Amino acid sequence: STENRVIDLVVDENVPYGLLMQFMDVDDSVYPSTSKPVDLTDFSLRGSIKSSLEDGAETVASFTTAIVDAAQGVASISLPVSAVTTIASKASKERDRYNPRQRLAGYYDVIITRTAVGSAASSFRIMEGKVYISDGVTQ
Amino acid sequence: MSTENRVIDLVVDENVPYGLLMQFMDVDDSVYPSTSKPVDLTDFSLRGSIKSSLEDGAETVASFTTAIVDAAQGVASISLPVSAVTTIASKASKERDRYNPRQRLAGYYDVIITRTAVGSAASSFRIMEGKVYISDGVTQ
Amino acid sequence: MSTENRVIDLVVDENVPYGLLMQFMDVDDSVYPSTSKPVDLTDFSLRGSIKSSLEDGAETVASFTTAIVDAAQGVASISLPVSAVTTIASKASKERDRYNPRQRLAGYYDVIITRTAVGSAASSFRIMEGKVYISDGVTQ
Amino acid sequence: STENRVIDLVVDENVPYGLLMQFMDVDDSVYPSTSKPVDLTDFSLRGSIKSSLEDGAETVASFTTAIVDAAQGVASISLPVSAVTTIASKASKERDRYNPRQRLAGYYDVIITRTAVGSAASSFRIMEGKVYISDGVTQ
Amino acid sequence: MSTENRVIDLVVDENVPYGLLMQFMDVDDSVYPSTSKPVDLTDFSLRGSIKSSLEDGAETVASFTTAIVDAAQGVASISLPVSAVTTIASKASKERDRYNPRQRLAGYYDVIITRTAVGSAASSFRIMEGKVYISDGVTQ
Amino acid sequence: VSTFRDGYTITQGEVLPYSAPAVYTNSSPLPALISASMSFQQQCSWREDRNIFDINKIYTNKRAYVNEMNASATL
Amino acid sequence: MFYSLMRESKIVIEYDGRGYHFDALSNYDASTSFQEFKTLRRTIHNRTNYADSIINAQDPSSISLAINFSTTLIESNFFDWMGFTREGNSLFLPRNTPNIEPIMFNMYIINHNNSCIYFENCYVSTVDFSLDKSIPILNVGIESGKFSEVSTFRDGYTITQGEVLPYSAPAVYTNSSPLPALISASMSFQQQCSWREDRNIFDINKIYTNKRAYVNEMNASATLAFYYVKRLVGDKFLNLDPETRTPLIIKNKYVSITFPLARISKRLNFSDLYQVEYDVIPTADSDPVEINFFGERK
Amino acid sequence: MRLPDPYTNPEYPGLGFESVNLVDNDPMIRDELPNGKVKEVKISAQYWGINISYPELFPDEYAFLDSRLLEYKRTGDYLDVLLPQYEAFRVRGDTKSVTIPAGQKGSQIILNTNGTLTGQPKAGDLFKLSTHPKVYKITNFSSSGNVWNISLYPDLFITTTGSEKPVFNGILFRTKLMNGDSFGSTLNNNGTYSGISLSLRESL
């Protein structure tokens, strides 16, 4: 995977979450800013959130994945408001003294996969890190 | 900049109706510097609230009376009347800021914009957050 | 982008009338250089009060008399007569400060400019704030 | 320059692993170093993952060598997701200091070989290091 | 006038044959610049042995196989097969070193080049010396 | 100035616990580290534009340009 | 692994094919470094941030040794190597510098486990010692051109410094009249050579090391510190007037630096107790400066 | 031909102008009348002059550069250069469908984009006609919808024939070398060619 590229997602309470990626391969040896959007046809990403980083952990939520634009390279990872509410319910209560809005919910990963006839399994991990819930008051 | 960007602090002045003027604008910087256009704010409703603490059981001390002054041009306004300001001032902590004695902590707040429309894009975003402070006054 | 200076501390002279005048000027930064036009003070009224403390229930030392000098030039004057100066001098703190025994703390003051009309929104605005000091005099 | 054979592999749990080695032959006689790729003829790579260096150590897994595009020098080393699961089963429960997701699974090394290209078995080790399993959350 | 470097430490790789080749070149410094001609290795033989210690009575870990590659170019190769590498690996010290668990001390080695013939003087010459280390491998 | 901007919300949290440094080449550790010092700079320069229109006035520098950026480390 | 301790070291100087192991070494300091050519090619096309640095030369090393006096007088070879002519156990400062280039020698700094640092093309550039109320010690300063790491080396088993000489109080004379109230006699000798950098376009893509040098000048100097003492009112012997030519000798039980004719400049300091300070250099036509090395019993 | 630069040859970052001097060269019959009035008559054609200074060039980069320059000196053609400070792509679109009405002489020019171009060319930017190789400099701009009114510092050398197309991007100066007669390069002991500079001069 990308051990050096761990990013912590922040989901707002009482708000549906949305995050969009762009798979866009580059080759700047010919000239700088030579980037071609990767075709995402017949790609299906999927992921999950679990409370602890070990086997036997209780699953918290599964992202409602989608492919917004095929052949344009714009994939999306997201989950509805009810799932965010479940995350907020399951999240820990060890609030920081100087970041009293963020609580830890669990760990997440998502895997992209190729399901092409004439091909084989091409699962690959593209995201890794933790899911932090930001508290909300306006409901 | 995970959350550092959409957080600012508001200081409502006691005995004065507080009104904050917002101007949405779609600024393009990655493609080219110095390019910005207003956001068509039609069907982009706003709503906000204030609470004393972040716990599950918190008191709704006040709530912004948001209004879209201009449908286009991306101009909106969040404001609360004099009664809400008085309620906030009464329901605020008695511990005064040392660097500015007139300011006392009132609570936390959020602002969500709901772009409900005919198109199936009923998304919601939290565009503001922070702490609410009350600035004491004497003119009454 | 710069900061404002709403906090201003006034120093009055005992046995002498105190006169302060404020000018409100419209400003803008554009392609042409800074264009300033005086703000027309129509239906604009002022009102200021002085109390010995910020905390609720403070004794009202006095109140300022408000007037508008020139609407076209956008000049408003906020001042108090000599009798009010004497009244504030009587109610000031008796604690002196060395290196200048004249000055004594009198309290805190605020000024709100408001525009009240049937078609006008019920909008107030705390233009300034700060503390009022007294330069004790011996004559009179 | 000198030697940099020691590189550590971080394989992902529940995801198949595949590494792409662009073999190359740089020479610094001329100031712009020659980009000539080695030509992959009569070459086979062998690699086993074995816990600890002591003799008699059990073979945790074995790398599956792929030789493709011999003209331009590239090659692939991989192992199926079942091999990944077998590796993750025997990994130690102690986690790495810098990343709380990695766990030491064993050691490895791949050995190039020429089989009678000139009636010589010119086999030498290419690379080496430690294999780290990165605990997943998706499954 | 400069120094030699007879002390060379070798590092072998477990499960892999080890091959080292030495070239002997005649040198001279004169009016014309450094003239180098390869030394003709005729009747020149090598022989090297490895023991776990310098002190007398040390166990012989293994011995090197010697060969001459090209007499005209003055190239001789000193190496050992893979089985000898395994033999030395078995007899190496079990004490590991952190920051690189691969390397272990195997012992000390010497190489003598000699020229033995009826007309040739009984002259030997210790060309090198040093210690032999092992890079433990897992494959095979 | 009298009134100012005070960062009630945007603030630094708790200090991170100490952890020993380590320098690697690829994945081979470099032994016997003493002190790794890193340095990063943006060596800008003020463009003094004090002119005859600023006579009898106090001039303050306003604009500057970047001569170079760099990243350095002494191990 | 093997760490390198300064206390566990041995410094051997290689001259003429013989190793001069300089024992009785109080302390030595040395450093090695490289010269770089780092330019930043910022252009209107690309205002880059990454420099173009190539290592092309070895910066000359500056090694300083502090060596105690010894009974076998191996340390006088530093005067011998620095350019002084020898007769018996006394070293003369020649009227003219003998050769254009200094006397070059190599030096080893041995350590355990066949570890060594090999300084080459060295020359003795400074030697100064202070005859005082503490044990005398001469700090020599040599400059190297090329440094290297080698496995085997030269170790001076036989040529070594003996036992340190016992302390003996210094005394400075004029002919045979002692100079009263001495504080600290410091002597200084130098061979102010200069490296001739000949880095040319044939050394591009290679590391250059300095190899040849020439002697700018040699000199012998001494700074004498006294207490301001007068025996008479309007004294003639002891005063502040300069002395164009006067025979001076800074004598000890084991060493005696002689100035056959000296140029003395005096400097008075109004400190807690008044101190006068001399500045002794040999005159234009003075005979060669003597440096005698007496091991024992003169 | 094209002068090598990091845009054409990114593998040679040493190429590229360390400093470029774009001088204005308009000869004029200036006369200082005794009454204080200064009268100047423009007769000789104006030509931009380009002074290019190069940073430390490594041997391979200088080999490429002087190979290209010697090819210039051999085949005798013109040497095009692209100033990068004027490469701000402020006008998108394809200018083939832009018509310039014929019969126009002088500084002013009128061109109809027919609703094709996106972006406004601000004053100080470059301008060049498709046919003639002269390079102008926009001094003032004014547009009424699609029609654009552009004022150029040098008067139009040739009267528009109704087919000339605007070129708002990738403008190359058709220049000639002025240092060719005695052009030397010094090689340091560091291994770089130092003080390489060119005094170009626009021809026609």
UniProtKB/Swiss-Prot annotation, chains B, C, E:
Pfam families: LtfC. The keyword Transcription does not apply. One of its GO terms (cellular component) is virus tail, fiber. It is found in: Virion. The keyword Signal does not apply. InterPro entries: LtfC/p132/Gp6_b-sand. It comes from the Viruses. Its main location: virion. Keywords: Late protein, Viral tail fiber protein, Viral tail protein, Virion. Forms the collar, into which the side tail fiber protein pb1 is anchored. Homododecamer. Interacts with baseplate tube protein p140. This is Collar protein p132. It comes from Escherichia phage T5 (Enterobacteria phage T5).
From Swiss-Prot, chain F:
This is Baseplate tube protein p140. Homotrimer. Forms a pseudo-hexameric ring. Interacts with collar protein p132, DTP-pb9 and tail tube protein pb6. It comes from Escherichia phage T5 (Enterobacteria phage T5). Coiled coil: none annotated. It is found in: Virion. Forms the simplified baseplate, together with the p132 collar protein ring and the cone (DTP-pb9 and BHP-pb3). The chain holds residues 150 to 224 of 298 of the full protein. It comes from the Viruses.
UniProtKB/Swiss-Prot annotation, chain H:
The keyword Flavoprotein does not apply. It comes from the Viruses. One of its GO terms (cellular component) is virus tail, baseplate. The keyword Cytoplasm does not apply. It is found in: Virion. It holds the Pfam family DTP-pb9_A-dom_N. Forms the simplified baseplate, together with the p132 collar protein, the baseplate tube protein p140 and baseplate hub protein pb3. This is Distal tail protein pb9. It comes from Escherichia phage T5 (Enterobacteria phage T5). The gene is D16.
